[PDB]
Amino acid sequence: SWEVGCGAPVPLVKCDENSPYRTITGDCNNRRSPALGAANRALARWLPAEYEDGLALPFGWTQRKTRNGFRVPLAREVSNKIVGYLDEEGVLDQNRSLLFMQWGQIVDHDLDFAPETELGSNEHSKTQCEEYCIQGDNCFPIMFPKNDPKLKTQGKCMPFFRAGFVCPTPPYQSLAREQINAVTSFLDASLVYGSEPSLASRLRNLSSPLGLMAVNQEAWDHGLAYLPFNNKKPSPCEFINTTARVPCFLAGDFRASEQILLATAHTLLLREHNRLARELKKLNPHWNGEKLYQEARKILGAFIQIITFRDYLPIVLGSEMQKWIPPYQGYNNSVDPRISNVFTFAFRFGHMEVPSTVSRLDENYQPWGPEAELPLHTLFFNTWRIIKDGGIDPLVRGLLAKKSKLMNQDKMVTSELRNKLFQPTHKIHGFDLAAINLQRCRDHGMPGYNSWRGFCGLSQPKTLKGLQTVLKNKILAKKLMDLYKTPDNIDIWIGGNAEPMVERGRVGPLLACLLGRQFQQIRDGDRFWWENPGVFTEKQRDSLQKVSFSRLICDNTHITKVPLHAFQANNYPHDFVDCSTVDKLDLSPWASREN
Ligand code: HEM
Ligand SMILES: *[C@@H]1O[C@H](CO)[C@@H](O)[C@H](O)[C@H]1NC(C)=O
Ligand SMILES: [Ca+2]
Numbered sequence: 001s002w003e004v005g006c007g008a009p010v011p012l013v014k015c016d017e018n019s020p021y022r023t024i025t026g027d028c029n030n031r032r033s034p035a036l037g038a039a040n041r042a043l044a045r046w047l048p049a050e051y052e053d054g055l056a057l058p059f060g061w062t063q064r065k066t067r068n069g070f071r072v073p074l075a076r077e078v079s080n081k082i083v084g085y086l087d088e089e090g091v092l093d094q095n096r097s098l099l100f101m102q103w104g105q106i107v108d109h110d111l112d113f114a115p116e117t118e119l120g121s122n123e124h125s126k127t128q129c130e131e132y133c134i135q136g137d138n139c140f141p142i143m144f145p146k147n148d149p150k151l152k153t154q155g156k157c158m159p160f161f162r163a164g165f166v167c168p169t170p171p172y173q174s175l176a177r178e179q180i181n182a183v184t185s186f187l188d189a190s191l192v193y194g195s196e197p198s199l200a201s202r203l204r205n206l207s208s209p210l211g212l213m214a215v216n217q218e219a220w221d222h223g224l225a226y227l228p229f230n231n232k233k234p235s236p237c238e239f240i241n242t243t244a245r246v247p248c249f250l251a252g253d254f255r256a257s258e259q260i261l262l263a264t265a266h267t268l269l270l271r272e273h274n275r276l277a278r279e280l281k282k283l284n285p286h287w288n289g290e291k292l293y294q295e296a297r298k299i300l301g302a303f304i305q306i307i308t309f310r311d312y313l314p315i316v317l318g319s320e321m322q323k324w325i326p327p328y329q330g331y332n333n334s335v336d337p338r339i340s341n342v343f344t345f346a347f348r349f350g351h352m353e354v355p356s357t358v359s360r361l362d363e364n365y366q367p368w369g370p371e372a373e374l375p376l377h378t379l380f381f382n383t384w385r386i387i388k389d390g391g392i393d394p395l396v397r398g399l400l401a402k403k404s405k406l407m408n409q410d411k412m413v414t415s416e417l418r419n420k421l422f423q424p425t426h427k428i429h430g431f432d433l434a435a436i437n438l439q440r441c442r443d444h445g446m447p448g449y450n451s452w453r454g455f456c457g458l459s460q461p462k463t464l465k466g467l468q469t470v471l472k473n474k475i476l477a478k479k480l481m482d483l484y485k486t487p488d489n490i491d492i493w494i495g496g497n498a499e500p501m502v503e504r505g506r507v508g509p510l511l512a513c514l515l516g517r518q519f520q521q522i523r524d525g526d527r528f529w530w531e532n533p534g535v536f537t538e539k540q541r542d543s544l545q546k547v548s549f550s551r552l553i554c555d556n557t558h559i560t561k562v563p564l565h566a567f568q569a570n571n572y573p574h575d576f577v578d579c580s581t582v583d584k585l586d587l588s589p590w591a592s593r594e595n
Contacts, residue, residue, distance in 0.1 A: 002175050006167040009040055021294045022301070022528050024193065024200040026184035029527050030333060037185040037337035037525065039195040042166045042178040043114065044338040047455055049176040049445035056165070056177030058140065058442040067448070073483040075438035076158070077145040078494060082479055083434040084418055085411040088356045093406035093569070096315070096353070096506070099549065100567045101404040102261050103312050104350040106269075109253050109262075110191045110304065111522070112344045114163045114179040114444070119170060130426060133157035140443065142435045150419075154430050162443050178341075179444055183253065185339045186526050187308060189300040192269045194252035203228075203252060204293065211277040211292020213270050214250075221391040222558060227251055227263075227270055236381040236424035244384035260379040261358060261399065264392045271556035273300055276587070284592045295590065302530030303547050305523075311549065311567055313519060317512050318505030324516020328523060331532045337525030339518065341444055342452065345493045346514040348437055349507050352407035352497060356414045360394030365401045365561075365572035368394040376414065377429050380422035393557050400553075400562065400576075403569055407506065409473050409498060441491045449495030449510075450488045456513035461487045472500045539589035546583045554579035 013027060015034045022029065026038035035041060052059050052067075060072045085091075093100070117138045120126050129139035133156045141157035144150055150158075163179045165172070184190045192213075194200035205212040216226035227249035237248040237257055248257035249266070256266045276296040281287065287295070314321050356376055360368035367373065368390065379385065386392055405414065413434050421431035450460040461467045467477035467487050476498055484490050499508025507515065528535050530544060549566040553559050560579045563570035570576065 005035070006042075006175060006178075008167045010035070011040075021298060022184075022186065022188055024184075024190075024197045025195060026186055026188070026190075029186060029337065030525070031527070032333060039182055039184050039190070041181060041338070043112070043181045043341040043344065043444075044336060045178070046340045046342055047447050047451060049178070049341075050447045050451070051177065051445045054176070055173070056445070058162075058439075058445070060439075060442050061135065061140070067489050068486055070485045070489060072442070072489060074145050075142050075435035075442075076148060076150075076432060078438055078483055078491070079413075079418060079432050079434040080145065080148060081483060082476065082494065082498075083412045084415065085408075086415075087411070088414070091405050091408055091411050091414075092355065092403040093353070093506075094403065095569055096404040096406070097400055097563075097567055097570055098261070098355070098358075098402040098404055099399045100312070100315070100506075101350060101353040101355075102265055102399060103307065103549070103567070104316075104347070104353065105262055106191065106265050107187070107304075107308050107312070108347045108350060109183070109255055110187055110189065111183065111185065111347070112339045113182040113253070113255070114344055115182055115254075116161045117164045117169070126425065129161060130159040133159075138162040140439065142432070142439050150430065154428070158431055158435065159426060160436065160439050163440070177445060181339055181344075185337050185522065186528070187301070187305050187522055188528075189252075189269070189297065189304050191251065191253040191256070191266065192273065192300060193297060199252065203250065206289070209289030209292070210281060211287070211289060211294075211296060213273045213277075213293075215270070215274070216249075219387050221393075224391075224557065225267075225271055225274065226387070227256070227267060234425075236422070237383045239427075240378075240381055240422070241384050244388050246384040246387050248381060248383055257381055257383050259376070260382050260385055261395060263383060263386065264395050264399070267386075267392050268396070268552055268556050269300065272303070272552055273297070275555055276300065276585075279587050280590060283587060283590060286592060286594075298528075298535075299544075299585075299590075301528070302536070302544050303552070305530050306544060306547055307549055309519075309523065311565075315504070315567060316506050317502070317516055319503040320505060320509070320512040320516060324512065325520045325523065328529070328531050331527055331529060332524045333527070335521055335525035337522055339522075340514075342446065342492065342514055343518045345437070345441055345444070345446060346496060346511050346518070348493055349407065349497050349511055351417065351433060351437065352412050353404040353506070354414060354417060355403070355405040356416050358395065359398045359402055360390055361397035361401055362394060365397055365576075368397075376416035377420035377422070380429070381424065393559055396553055396557055396559060400566065400570055401572055407497065407501075409471070409476050409500070412497070437493045438491050441493050446492050448488050449490035449492055452492050452496070452514065453510055456510055458510060458513070463487075471498050473498075537589055543586045543589055547585050548582065551582055551584060554582060555584065 030036040059067045183195045205214040229247040230250040235247045257263045359373045362368045417433040420429045422429045496511040550562040561576045563575045
């Protein structure tokens with residue numbers, strides 16, 4: 001028994017139970033427990049942290065200190081030897097649109113962030129990790145292995161800075177290190193509205209009470225809006241093209257301009273807010289700034305939940321779907337809504353669903369222009385290709401008409417992300433998201449692959465032959481064995497993803513367990529789950545049941561041809577239909593039954 005919460009950042013918790021709306025921070029969702037699921041708290045531990053020194057040192061930190069008697073392979077080496085591949089041909093998912101990937105990142109960003117430590121934004125110390133490759137205090141560089149091509153063109157490591165952790169932050173050493181979650185655990189649309197009341201207000205268009213979200217004043221998208229620019233210099237988005245000089249956007253989530261399609265989806269979501277809001281005033285003139293804001297917010301959340309839970313989850317989890325997430329029975333205030341530390345790694349499967357290129361398509365779903373298809377790496381923190389190069393519409397057409405990468409055991413993560421990732425305050429397009437997941441796994445004190453197979457009630461292979469059988473691959477298992485020398489040491493990110501898919505899923509059984517549990521927990525433990533009676537009306541819930549991503553495009557872009565089932569592989573024109581024939585969101589039940 002160590003205590004009941006460790007809090008020095010528990011920065012004003014006065015509870016109003018009496019609300020028809022969520023807080024911004026997530027506080028006061030569980031009334032019996034007010035801080036459960038709020039942002040700025042520790043990620044839940046489903047299993048105890050496993051650090052090198054028991055407390056907060058990652059496995060791999062001290063050269064001579066092993067895990068279960070072996071050295072841990074270098075993140076980058078696992079990435080070269082197992083994660084890499086060259087041939088992009090035949091890697092596409094024939095049953096998933098590119099929107100299946102992108103929705104995944106939307107939801108992941110609504111659910112969790114564990115951002116790098118904040119005890120250094122303008123010091124030597126920062127560039128000391130990029131420049132000198134010195135394992136330090138929160139600097140934990142990713143070292144290149146003997147044979148690595150990057151040694152020839154980049155230096156000795158990739159810079160990497162340990163995730164933040166709760167309570168102290170300037171010097172710490174007493175209980176087990178627990179990483180923070182800076183977003184709300186609830187599927188709430190916090191990526192559109194922010195998780196802090198500070199940021200939540202800054203994004204609002206206060207200058208008039210129409211419950212509108214603050215839009216971009218310097219540019220437009222033919223009559224349609226953009227997110228406002230974040231004006232913080234220096235700017236990663238300005239850095240990628242000094243001539244076009246377009247900054248990153250300002251969203252309720254800071255990751256929004258990471259890659260162009262993320263920024264597109266975010267863009268659609270704000271347009272829905274405002275659309276929704278305006279349709280409301282054209283119903284209710286009585287309402288003031290808040291009631292319109294909050295009431296569209298509330299609708300934005302439910303749509304997020306319905307799309308994720310009705311359209312998205314069933315094709316991630318497949319046969320395992322109703323096993324982990326059975327039909328809803330209502331809010332269970334005994335359920336734990338917090339995101340587990342492990343989930344923030346399990347949902348990284350999405351990393352293998354990302355293809356090497358992104359296309360703009362025109363009105364006929366043909367190759368927009370002479371640069372239709374762009375390599376993914378040029379789109380990190382790329383906001384200029386939207387504003388100065390077409391709007392979001394051809395990219396959205398892409399999202400429908402194009403396919404996600406299918407995860408593949410001999411072809412795991414495209415080199416766009418594996419060799420050419422762009423990171424802010426780093427000058428080069430040369431990072432490795434895989435190596436970085438793996439460093440991160442260890443950073444976060446993740447129990448290895450068998451602790452999680454155990455936790456999921458699954459077999460624990462102890463030998464190569466064991467692993468071949470589970471992974472159903474003789475080759476991969478062997479390389480995993482050579483690198484790790486016990487399946488107890490396999491990093492959860494790589495072992496869960498190496499597993500073969502379940503029937504009509506896109507993850508293997510261990511991930512479906514980790515994912516399934518977590519999504520069940522975010523539905524059941526949520527007082528404001530759209531389907532929890534008391535949140536909307538019999539009638540309000542009947543309109544909601546009509547919302548489709550297809551519709552969201554229709555009413556928020558100048559696209560007018562869309563498929564029914566946005567998430568599967570859809571080819572023009574045999575799978576498309578007009579905006580016309582697509583059930584819209586009938587907003588009447590939100591008409592004030594008051595004068
Ligand atoms: C090109 C598209 C994507 C890019 C560029 C990208 C990039 C990144 C980066 C830079 C990080 C932080 C890594 C670290 O420092 O630990 C990250 C983390 C993460 N990624 Fe992605 N990612 C992409 C797509 C996706 C998809 C499709 C999913 C899910 C389906 C996903 C899920 C996650 C999650 C859950 C985290 C951890 C978030 C946290 O809790 O801190 N990503 N990704
Ligand atoms: C908010 O909306 C009003 C009315 O549509 C508009 O005039 C104003 O420019 C908007 N403000 C911002 C900051 O987006
Ligand atoms: Ca959230």
